[PDB]
Amino acid sequence: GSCKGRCFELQEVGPPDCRCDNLCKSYSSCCHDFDELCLKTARGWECTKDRCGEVRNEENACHCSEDCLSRGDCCTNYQVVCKGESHWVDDDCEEIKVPECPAGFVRPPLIIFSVDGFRASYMKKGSKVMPNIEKLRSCGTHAPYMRPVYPTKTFPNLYTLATGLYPESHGIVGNSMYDPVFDASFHLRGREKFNHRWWGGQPLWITATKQGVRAGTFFWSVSIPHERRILTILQWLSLPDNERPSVYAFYSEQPDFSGHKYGPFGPEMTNPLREIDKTVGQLMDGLKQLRLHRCVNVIFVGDHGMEDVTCDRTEFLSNYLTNVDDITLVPGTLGRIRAKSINNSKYDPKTIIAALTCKKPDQHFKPYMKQHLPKRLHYANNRRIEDIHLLVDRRWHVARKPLDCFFQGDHGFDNKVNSMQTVFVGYGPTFKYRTKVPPFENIELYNVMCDLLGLKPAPNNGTHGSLNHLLRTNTFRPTMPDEVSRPNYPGIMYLQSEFDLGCTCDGSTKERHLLYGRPAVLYRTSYDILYHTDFESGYSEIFLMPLWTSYTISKQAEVSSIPEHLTNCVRPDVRVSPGFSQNCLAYKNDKQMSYGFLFPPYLSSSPEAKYDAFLVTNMVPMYPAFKRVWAYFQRVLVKKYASERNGVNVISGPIFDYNYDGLRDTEDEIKQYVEGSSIPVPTHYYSIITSCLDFTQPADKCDGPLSVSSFILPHRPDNDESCASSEDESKWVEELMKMHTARVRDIEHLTGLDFYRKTSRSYSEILTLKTYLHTYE
Ligand SMILES: *[C@@H]1O[C@H](CO)[C@@H](O[C@@H]2O[C@H](CO)[C@@H](O[C@@H]3O[C@H](CO[C@H]4O[C@H](CO[C@H]5O[C@H](CO)[C@@H](O)[C@H](O)[C@@H]5O[C@H]5O[C@H](CO)[C@@H](O)[C@H](O)[C@@H]5O)[C@@H](O)[C@H](O[C@H]5O[C@H](CO)[C@@H](O)[C@H](O)[C@@H]5O[C@H]5O[C@H](CO)[C@@H](O)[C@H](O)[C@@H]5O)[C@@H]4O)[C@@H](O)[C@H](O[C@H]4O[C@H](CO)[C@@H](O)[C@H](O)[C@@H]4O)[C@@H]3O)[C@H](O)[C@H]2NC(C)=O)[C@H](O)[C@H]1NC(C)=O
Ligand SMILES: C[C@H](CCC(=O)NCCNC(=O)OCc1cc(Cl)cc(Cl)c1)[C@H]1CC[C@H]2[C@@H]3[C@@H](O)C[C@@H]4C[C@H](O)CC[C@]4(C)[C@H]3CC[C@]12C
Ligand SMILES: [Ca+2]
Ligand code: NA
Ligand SMILES: [Zn+2]
Ligand SMILES: [Zn+2]
């Protein structure tokens, strides 16, 4: 029938009856008089001097009458223009030590002010362009930037913000995507996106509602202007106790649009940024009118940044592939390739990758099978992610052919790129005051938003506790996980004559080489701790190799060669059974597989100590192509890092992730072995390299904060990824490593290990350390 007294209901009323909620427009379900009653424009969105104390005219957009405050339907500037109040922006900064809410409020409400395409570096423009945002940032808690998820597109990131999940888990892997089981495509434009089957996880509003916390908004019909959205939130905040939501969301599509048209550094970006600020001011003036400006927690968050990208900087797949009419390409700042028709017999991923690899000197993209993408991107474990992927260089596009500028800016690139970085500000009672915090990942906010609302988060990819330092009052205290498998400490048991492995050759440990305690194994397994002069390891009897190998290299330690009488030296480990050892005959028979060592023989403390490096229990399967990467790391780079960081602690080991879910594989999940043998082949090799943040203190006597960098190098039988691999390792290996930079937390998921158990630092601080990522930007 009609929307009278029902404009912006917090309920979708039962079909077939017409709706009056904030989404009715999106479902073509509004009553005939929704536009008339609920979308009033008359006399704008701002009170004027002459309108003060007017008689209520029902048809005004917002009101300047005496009864307006009683209702909560004044314009946002009413008190400023009429009652002589100041704009929120013009008031001094003042610490909110507790929530100052009206009587009935049970929790501080949370409002999420999300902005699209908002680049981290826009905040440098400051008070001159955005005085309201600059106040929020300065007065509350802010980071220099926040890292989005890849791909750095709107919908993957927005739903990542809502769920705490990587796109591969929540299932919104792109703005555009195709699902082979559904046989349907998802797009901005279409009915398909209205089907719940695309949207996985548990967004914050569902978490809120499941636990009796009432949840507003989030998605808004695009036809509803910005000012009306702000007024509706303010109207909802004036509802009675039993009806009023404790969580709201506003979304601005700016400054993405102007970013796309004019580029990120274009002078045309100012008015759009002023427009955002104005909307923020309307919210804050509004809150201050309702006496909620020191009650509500406000998060000002972006989804990703914006880069200079013109259509003249485009790569065409038709310049590489002979039959581009046989494929479908998801184009732009990334690439996803798939067969055009499923029933094409000629289609073949191998030939396509071959044809797109290192062909032109300047080539501005790189092809990957999805499993070989840097593990830090976490973009592979979903049937909607095409097997073939193209990582496009910043500032460039990839298209299928020339007949596939109207745009000077775009985004979507690798989430470590500077231009893709975006904003975070937290303002309110629960956030800290005048506080700067380090950059962090948008996957972490869901937990924080649960904490601000007193909700138990659903399982997600944030590390709960890692952002406790953003908050005045922490409702979550993290605790270390319990160790599952106790290590064994095997003595000297077996004779050398008891081994027919086909191999030929010629105490203080713990406090020196495990600076941060023994890693805890968080699954059922059988492993041995092995002590040596120069290194300690947790040797697996199932996988026949170390789970981890830990050692410390001071700034003044020497790099010695491998003497060539020990070139093929592998020694049986007296402390481990032949039945739980590797054998060298497998390596001999396996024509594609050589081997390497986790503790480097190159950094041995003495000649006698160097022999411990050639034990069968320090040995790990390596492809000759990969041995170029690993040998350059161990020989040159680890010393380099010790010198520059005043010593370094290094924990190295294998990872098995054949089903590319970013999680530790079980035995069955291993799909490759050294031939005719039970030696499992790792998919990647990690290292965690720790030192004292204060570089003046050595690594082994650090009284302050720690400094970490890590990687997860893929274990590849070629170096096709590195187009300069024909050249010397100084030209290419370090770039390859930087691209596969990782967080310690990535390694823990992939290994089922837990590091940094014995430190003199709080566990929240350690959780922050584990989520850190060295980006090399
Ligand atoms: C990032 O964080 C993620 C979440 O913690 C991690 O992802 C999880 O990984 C685990 C381990 O592989 C996986 O577990 C499997 O689940 C199988 C059942 O799958 C269906 O149900 C689950 C659970 O339902 C609910 O719980 C989630 C939290 O995970 C919540 O977000 C949901 O809203 C839902 O909530 C409701 O229930 C809870 C619990 O009672 C209540 O608290 C709450 O109030 C709600 O009422 C769903 O998560 C699954 O979702 C997938 O599938 C749908 C439909 O296709 C997709 O739309 C969705 O996007 C998602 O798809 C992704 O995951 C699947 C695999 O699960 C991938 O194949 C796909 O490519 C996507 O990545 C399903 O609806 C279960 O059968 C299975 O059991 C087997 O293993 C166990 C041992 O573990 C054995 O005992 C058995 O023998 C089985 O062999 C297994 O338990 C989770 O499903 C998955 N969760 C999510 C959300 O992704 C991720 O690993 C982590 N990443 C990193 C790098 O750390
Ligand atoms: C996709 C479509 C909305 C169209 C659009 O572009 N709207 C822009 C405004 N967006 C907005 O305000 O979002 C705020 C926001 C902020 C943050 Cl930080 C994070 C997020 Cl995720 C969002 C909408 C309209 C209706 C939506 C469906 C809904 O009606 C029913 C389901 C609800 C469920 O929780 C998810 C799946 C749905 C099918 C919704 C999918 C998206 C729809 C179609
Ligand atoms: Ca796995
Ligand atoms: Na070999
Ligand atoms: Zn966006
Ligand atoms: Zn955009």
- Report the 3 state secondary structure along 594-645: EEEECCCHHHCCCHHHHCHHHEHHHEEEECHHHHHHHHHHHHHHHHHHHHHH
Residues 6+ apart with CB under 8 A from 696: 646
Q: Distance, CA 661 to ligand 3 centroid (Å)?
A: 5
CA of 620 from ligand 3 middle (Å) equals 19
What residues form DSSP beta bridges with 332? 398
Report the atom number in ligand 1 closest to the C-alpha of 662. 104
Cβ pair 626, 717 in contact under 8 A: yes
- How big, in percent rounded to 5, are the helix, strand and coil portions of the chain? 30, 20, 50
Pocket test for ligand 2, best of 153, 219, 247 (most atoms within 8 A of CB): 219
Q: Which amino acid belongs to residue 8?
A: F
Q: State this model's resolution in angstroms.
A: 2.1
Mutate to test the pocket of ligand 1, among 169, 210, 466 (most ligand atoms within 8 A of CB): 169
Farthest-apart Cα atoms in the chain, separation:
104
Buried b (16+ CB within 10 A) or exposed e, 705-725: ebbbbbbbbbbbeebbbbbeb
Nearest CA-CA partner of 108 in 247, 251, 291, 281: 247
Which are the contacts of 697, defined by CB distance < 8 A and separation ≥ 6? 646, 703, 704
Is there a contact between 134 and 273 (Cβ–Cβ < 8 Å)? no
Q: Are 421 and 146 in contact (CB under 8 A)?
A: yes
Kindly report the protein residue whose alpha carbon is nearest to atom 25 of ligand 1.
Answer: 201
Determine contact, residues 524/541, Cβ cutoff 8 Å: no
DSSP string, 93-162: P---SS----TT-SS--EEEEEEET-BGGGGGGGGGT-HHHHHHHHHSEE-S-EE-PSS--HHHHHHHHH
Ligand found nearest the CA of 446? 2
* Structure-block tokens of residue 90: 């013009």
Q: What size, in residues, is the chain?
A: 777
- Nearest Cα residue to 387 out of 358, 410, 367, 412: 367
**Alpha carbon separation from 615 to 50, 490, 723 (Å, rounded):** 89, 15, 35
As given in the structure block, the two tokens for residue 584 are 């060298």
Q: Is 260 helix (H, G, I), strand (E, B) or coil?
A: helix
The verdict on whether 154 is a catalytic residue reads: yes
Phi-psi region of 298 (alpha: psi -120 to 50; beta: other; left: phi over 0): beta
Backbone angles phi, psi at 451, to 5 degrees: -65, -40
| SS3 state of residue 339 | strand
Ligand nearest to the CA of residue 162, numbered in listed order: 2
CA 172–ligand 1 middle distance (angstroms):
15
Contact assessment for residue 72 and residue 290, using Cβ atoms and an 8 Å cutoff: yes
Distance CA 602, CA 634 (A): 7
- Strands 684-692 and 648-655, by their bridges, are antiparallel
Compute φ and ψ for 84, nearest 5 degrees.
70, 25
The strand ranges marked E within 331-415 are 334-339, 365-369, 388-392, 397-399, 409-410
At a CB cut-off of 8 Å and minimum separation 6, what does 207 contact? 450, 455, 456, 457, 458
Strands 536-540 and 545-553: antiparallel
Ligand 1 nearest atom to the CA of residue 163, by list position: 31
Handedness of CA 590, 593, 597, 598 (dihedral sign): negative
Residues in the chain after which the backbone breaks (C–N beyond 2.5 Å): 404, 506
The structure's method of determination equals X-ray
**Which amino acid is residue 501, in one-letter code?**
L
- Cα(286) to centroid of ligand 2, in Å? 25
The 8-class DSSP code of residue 215 comes to: B
Is the alpha carbon torsion for 360, 364, 370, 375 positive or negative?
Answer: positive
- 180: CB partners within 8 A, 6+ apart: 383, 384
Using DSSP, state whether 448 is helix, strand or coil.
helix
CA 729, CA 735: separation in Å to the nearest integer? 10
Compute the distance from residue 373 Cα to the ligand 3 centre, in Å: 15
Cα–Cα distance measured from residue 744 to residue 771, given in angstroms and rounded to the nearest whole number:
7
> What's the start-to-end Cα distance of the chain, in Å?
59
**Are the beta carbons of 602 and 519 closer than 8 angstroms?**
no
User: Is ligand 1 within 6 A of the CB of residue 461?
Assistant: yes
Closest Cα to atom 38 of ligand 1: 458
496-771 maps to which CATH number? 3.40.570.10
DSSP 8-class letter at 509: H
| Residue closest to 712 by CA, chosen among 736, 742, 738 | 742
| Angle, vertex CA 314, rays to CA 329 and CA 723, nearest 5 | 85
Print burial letters for 599-618: b (CB count within 10 Å at least 16), e (below 16). bbbbbbbeeeebbbbbbbbb
Coil, strand or helix at 647: coil
* Cα–Cα distance measured from residue 733 to residue 719, given in angstroms and rounded to the nearest whole number: 10
Residue of the CA atom closest to atom 10 of ligand 2:
219
Of 205, 420, 215, 426, residue with least CA distance to 300: 426
- Identify the active-site residue in 141, 154, 690, 768: 154
Task: Report how far residue 9's alpha carbon sits from residue 13's, in angstroms, rounded to the nearest whole number.
Answer: 9
Tell me how far apart the alpha carbons of residues 657 and 461 are, in angstroms, rounded to a whole number: 17
Integer Cα distance of 44 and 403 in angstroms: 45
Instruction: Round to whole Å and give the CA distance between 487 and 536.
Output: 13
Atom 74 of ligand 1, nearest CA residue: 200
Ligand nearest to the CA of 751: 3
Structure tokens at 652: 């190295």
User: How far apart (Å, rounded) are the C-alpha atoms in residues 670 and 621?
Assistant: 14
Q: What is the CA radius of gyration of the chain?
A: 30
Q: Tokens for 183? A: 């046989």
Which ligand is located closest to the Cα atom of residue 596? 4
Amino acid letter, residue 370: K
* Residue 270 per-residue DSSP state: H
Using CA atoms, how far residue 93 sits from 273, 279, 470, in Å, is: 22, 20, 18
User: The tokens 């190799």 sit on which residue?
Assistant: 545
Distance, in Å, from the CA atom of 593 to the CA atom of 717, rounded to the nearest integer, reads 8
Q: What's the distance, CA 565 to chain centroid?
A: 48
Using CB atoms within 10 Å of the CB of residue 376, give its burial: 0 to 12 exposed, 13 to 18 middle, 19+ buried: buried
Task: Report the phi/psi class of residue 342: left, alpha or beta, with left for phi > 0 and alpha for psi in -120 to 50.
Answer: alpha
Burial class (CB in 10 A: 0-12, 13-18, 19+), 508: exposed
**What sign does the dihedral 622-624-628-634 (CA atoms) show?**
positive
Distance CA 287, CA 82 (A): 17
Q: How far is the CA of 658 from the centre of ligand 3 (A)?
A: 6
Q: 579: which residues sit within 8 A by CB, 6+ positions away?
A: none
Residue 608 and residue 51: Cα distance in Å, rounded? 92
Tell me the two tokens of residue 709: 């960098």
Q: Where are the alpha helices (DSSP H) in 419-473?
A: 445-452
Q: Which atom of ligand 2 is nearest to the CA of 303?
A: 18
Q: What residue has token string 């349907």?
A: 184
Q: Is the CB of 523 under 6 A from ligand 2?
A: no
Tokens of 703: 């009284």
- In this structure, the residue with its CA closest to atom 97 of ligand 1 is 201
Burial of 94 (0-12, 13-18, 19+ CB in 10 A): exposed
Phi-psi region of 568 (alpha: psi -120 to 50; beta: other; left: phi over 0): alpha
Q: Which element (helix H / strand E) includes 767? A: helix 763-771
Task: Tell me the three state secondary structure of residue 562.
Answer: coil
What CA–CA distance (Å, rounded) separates 333 from 305?
A: 13
Residue with tokens 């909700």: 455
Q: Which two tokens stand for residue 776?
A: 């090399």
